[PDB]
Design a protein around this ligand. Sequence first.
Ligand SMILES: [Ca+2]
Ligand SMILES: [Ca+2]
Ligand SMILES: [Ca+2]
Ligand SMILES: [Ca+2]
Lengths: 155, 356
Amino acid sequence: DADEIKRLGKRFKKLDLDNSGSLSVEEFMSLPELQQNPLVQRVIDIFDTDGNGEVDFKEFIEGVSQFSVKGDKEQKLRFAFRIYDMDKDGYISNGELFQVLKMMVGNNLKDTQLQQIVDKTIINADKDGDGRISFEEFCAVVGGLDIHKKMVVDV
Amino acid sequence: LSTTDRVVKAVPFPPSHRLTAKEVFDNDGKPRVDILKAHLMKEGRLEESVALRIITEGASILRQEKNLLDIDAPVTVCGDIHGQFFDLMKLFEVGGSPANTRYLFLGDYVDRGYFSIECVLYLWALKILYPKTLFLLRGNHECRHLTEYFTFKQECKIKYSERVYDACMDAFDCLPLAALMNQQFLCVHGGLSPEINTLDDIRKLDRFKEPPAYGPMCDILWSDPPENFGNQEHFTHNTVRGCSYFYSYPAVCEFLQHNNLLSILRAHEAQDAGYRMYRKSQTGFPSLITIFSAPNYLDVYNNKAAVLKYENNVMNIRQFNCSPHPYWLPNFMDVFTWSLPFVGEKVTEMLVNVLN
Ligand SMILES: [Ca+2]
Ligand SMILES: [Ca+2]
Ligand SMILES: [Ca+2]
Ligand SMILES: [Ca+2]
């Protein structure tokens, strides 16, 4: 849509403070309400599909495209799935499950409690014995919660 | 720090292996309760078939007992446990090994303690192994209404299965209601009832069912003395519980005289000292004594527990404090169910602010 292309052009240009054509973490952090958000670097890293530390226009477009009103349930739940899967192999493993819980909870849990509940969730939810959570197990667990209704954004 | 190896190495990792029937039951079928106690103390689990065998054998034993057991002194009488397995362990430390100590429990094994299934499994193993020296009564929380209202069902579904829950409910239906101790004392969870005038009224009840929301089984499990007990109506509506009744001092004295009893013993309400002696009967002997064995009730009360060891014509109250236990999040929620709403909330907030 024309107004959408125009708005994405204007926002890209406004965020690219040094006019380098790519958005760095520092450039996002120039926004005051982002300076105290502890998950900025994780979202940027997820956007950075080529791992160069910045978000180019292609990455920006593909990222925004997953939040369109026309996107289906699977697209949203797969974005949420990709939030945990830092290494992008399609499975939540012990190490990355620990890392992601530690990023999200900070000091809200002690290391002992968090490690214990990570262990217990892995044990109770792993059904094929590979120590990680496949997409099938994920939908078996969360498919009935109707969380897809809240992950909607108006562009 | 490693992302795979365990952070707190001084904590031993609990065993995952499920014990088999040959490892837990000897050639004659008796539970090997020292191994089982060590394993459960390690948060170890059983094979499903072994849990079901223990539960159904214990249910069958309770099922074959009378409503009112005939139990000679000496005996140690114990009140509410409420899933405090490590406090049950302390209780057995204070009262003495079941190998040579008679025990009576007054109920509330389940409902808000986070080791209810471990309590059930251990007590059922002791009851199978010690059928005439360890005794378990039914409390008012031992029912479907409350276990579906409270957290016991979630605990069963997290650690075992809903089938294990149903097995627990059928075993609980078998729990005796009362004990006759040294042919002198009636021991119950709650107290007296308008519909019980003779011991035969207790013997004639049908107990093999979920406790109703009202009626004699409900009042037996739920009634309390008034908070102002001892300081003219025999039975008054119990406004604290929302069911059953308060009974008065004349009511108690009449019951004692008509049934040739010395005193009544019940539980269910926390007390700062672990016990309360109310107004004495018209001899110097207290007409009523309450004993309460659930320490730090609801994890916040900070109260002591006590048990009553009746032996050599001495009633020795032994109190004990609560003991540490491992942590569970409320209602046994797993970390995905717990954290995903917060993840979605904070990621959505971030995206909305970055974009708008
Ligand atoms: Ca830059
Ligand atoms: Ca990087
Ligand atoms: Ca790895
Ligand atoms: Ca693993």
